[PDB]
Amino acid sequence: AQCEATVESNDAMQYNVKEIVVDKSCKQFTMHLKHVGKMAKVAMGHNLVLTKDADKQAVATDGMGAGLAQDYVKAGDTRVIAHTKVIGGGESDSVTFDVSKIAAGENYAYFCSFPGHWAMMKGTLKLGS
Ligand SMILES: [Cu+]
């Protein structure tokens, strides 16, 4: 609703939403992430990272090497448009980004960069109204 969306992540390594459509009327957009499971962030942590589809694996790979304290996102990665912190069960986080950083027709992927999660936790985000 409005210029925001909510994605729930669980203990089975899955997002409940696979596609997010950003309305052209939005100048800013907010992504809310909820970890609805009961596992600790050291075993089943989740975040939400947004990049062009092409940059997915590269960003997830470098992110793994950043560590948990860095929310598994390489500090100052220019390929990441927006990202939340890594959360454990019973928690949540939000991230707001500039819609101008998004282009029509372009393909964007949101995924979890916690080690090994990217291969199963991913969705598509795009501008469209
Ligand atoms: Cu995850």
Ligand 1 centroid – CA 51 distance (Å): 16
Is 35 annotated as a binding-site member?
no
3-state secondary structure of 72: coil
PDB resolution in Å: 1.8
C-to-N gaps above 2.5 Å in the chain, after residues: none
CA of 24 to the centre of ligand 1 (A): 29
Ligand 1 centre from 46 Cα, in Å? 3
Q: Which of 70, 63, 89, 81 is nearest to 22 (CA)?
A: 81
Nearest to 115 by CA among 20, 13, 9, 31: 13
Q: Could you give the CA distance from residue 38 to residue 89 in angstroms, rounded to a whole number?
A: 4
Domains of the chain: 1-129 (2.60.40.420)
Alpha carbons 102 and 121: distance in angstroms, whole number: 21
Residues near ion ligand 1 (CB < 5 Å) are 46, 112, 114, 117
Please tell me whether 83 is known to bind a ligand.
Answer: no
Integer Cα distance of 57 and 13 in angstroms: 17
Q: What's the sign of the alpha-carbon dihedral 88, 89, 91, 97?
A: positive
Tell me the one-letter amino acid at 37: G
Structural contact between residues 4 and 108, judged by C-beta atoms closer than 8 angstroms: no
CA of 11 to the centre of ligand 1 (A): 9
